[PDB]
């Protein structure tokens, strides 16, 4: 059967490993990014104290929901009236567990899916619309750029930095060989980049394996890097990965 390398951050990695194990798929976890919470600056705290200026808040990732909820809880006994948005169901559920109503697409692989969602566009129907994006220190500029194009002002709240964990030399190749892995999962472009960087000289070998990517954009990024077997899952969730595994080899 399928024997997969997972490369997602540690917390999301364990939840995926468990789902895959429950479905009877073997996996080995090698997080290619670690999540380092950011120290809130005075300018960032001000954004949070003025959270009620935003008609929508977009949470781009599971760590952004977790860390973003900490600051919400810190500064808001009662959350202001605004629309909370997510790209996927899995990010939405962290917010939902807190008690928020979340706007998100059902297909939901990428920023585009949220951007095109009628419920999301409706939340922008406001005088001088302002949106807050909760995310890492860096990321995709697409959503901000597009929102600004429609006359929406866009602020970022960085919550964490993403860094490559330090592994003993050869960890990636050792894992693929020792665990007889026949597939790789990445869940983002940065994750895919870190994989290429860590593969280094063994990339011709590693790039050979079925590479399961969450979206068309990441699929394109992977071809550009020389990955020979690029597989587009319809999103980053476990069910999406299972359906993609069934269809592949
Ligand atoms: Cl992954
Ligand atoms: Cl970052």
Residue numbers in the entry: 3 to 251
Q: What's the paper's own text on this?
A:
Pseudomonas aeruginosa is a Gram-negative pathogen responsible for a significant level of hospital-acquired infections, particularly in burns victims and immunocompromised and cystic fibrosis patients. In an effort to accelerate early steps in drug discovery, the EU-funded AEROPATH project aims to identify novel targets in the opportunistic pathogen Pseudomonas aeruginosa by applying a multidisciplinary approach encompassing target validation, structural characterization, assay development and hit identification from small-molecule libraries. The crystal structures of eight of these targets, ranging from hypothetical unknown proteins to metabolic enzymes from different functional classes (PA1645, PA1648, PA2169, PA3770, PA4098, PA4485, PA4992 and PA5259), are reported here. The structural information is expected to provide a firm basis for the improvement of hit compounds identified from fragment-based and high-throughput screening campaigns.
Uroporphyrinogen III (U3) is the first cyclic tetrapyrrole compound in the haem-biosynthesis pathway and is located at a metabolic branching point. From U3, biosynthetic routes lead to haem, sirohaem or cobalamin (vitamin B12).
